[model samples]
Target: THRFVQKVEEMVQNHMTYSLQDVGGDANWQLVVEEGEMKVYRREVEENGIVLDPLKATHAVKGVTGHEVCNYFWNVDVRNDWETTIENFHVVETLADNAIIIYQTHKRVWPASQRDVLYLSVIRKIPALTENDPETWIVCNFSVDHDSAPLNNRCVRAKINVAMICQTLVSPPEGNQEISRDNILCKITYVANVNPGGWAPASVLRAVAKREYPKFLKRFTSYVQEKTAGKPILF
Candidate 1:
């Protein structure tokens, strides 16, 4: 289950509201603040709670809320490295340019509990991919989240990453083969049912805050940075 359904209109069809809470099934998809890193997530609140029991292998994080909005604990099936995933950590690869190749990344998943949690994160390689390809780099962590619309109890969404990527380049090489570290790139694109508002239709809720709510965004930004420094692990 992808977050963006073809176009943004698909979400409007569901009678969803405009605010973050409305879009996220509550007020909105507020930026989650951990030790200091900004987390991207949407949430819904229910007094009675929703009942979700996955019949398939596991439910994706994006598809989690539909079944247990107010449950004591909601569960979603996440990748093997579900818990203890932190934000903005450097995953060192081969050193290039006589400098250490460091990847500073942040990954977050929703509704953390003892049960399965469906979440995805991107490990963005820093200092660019290569001197010639400033835009290229690697994204080894592949994870999944669900779209806004839920068919049953759960759906599946994935953040596919490669060892190298370029920001300017839109097209990618075809095939199943992985790229080299010099050409590796990683970015987190969600497949969810909700959209924050204005400008971009398929953008994270926090993106809107960075532009509109500068104060809140700043606080959120600092929080995330603190977490990164404190080594606080996020779910």
Candidate 2:
């Protein structure tokens, strides 16, 4: 038997707190990050970089209303007092091209059951019942028409490369952290499915996760880069 030997060990220390780093991707879309009530939307660029889109900024603290924040949510006392909170909200899902966005209006009990398939199943039936396509049933569209989309209720879309691999969901154990860990915090996989109308890469799903549930961990880097390698000027 061989014994493992200790290698290099280094300590990292930083007294200052900084935001996410920029890696680089497509400049076509915008990235939004919202932590609880903190909200921000910014666009990618080549020369100047990350231009903040004011239209998607968080609501002013002075503009929130009493009915907006819930009693359980942090800062509910003061969070709900602003007037413009009605205009400030997180984006949930990005349905396919022809489909409508869907989410439970009221918060559902935690520990989502895979057995309660019908809840998501029936909600899915809407697009199924309406669309004529037999094979490609799920309306998985990546590009969102921001201009026509409703102000508060809208979806952000992105065009990701087909080569990028996505992850799958993991079953969490009993406990608050577990439920939120995988069920809520886990990263969902995105596979391109010619059989089921393309998975549209998991990064697009991250866009929804970023703005809607900012507290959840995200794998998407804050940078934008071309979709290919061994070449300059995006191919």
Candidate 1 C-alpha lDDT tens digits along 89-161: 3324322221222222224323212122222222233343466543322222222233422223232222222
Candidate 2 lDDT at 119 equals 8
Q: Which one wins on TM-score?
A: 1
lDDT of each: 0.25, 0.22
TM-score of each: 0.20, 0.18
54-102, model 2: which lDDT tens digit per residue?
1122221211111111111112123223322122332333332222222
What is the lDDT, from 0 to 100, of the residue 112 in candidate 2? 22
Query: Backbone clashes in each candidate structure, one number apiece?
Result: 40, 16
Q: What RMSD does model 1 have?
A: 18.2
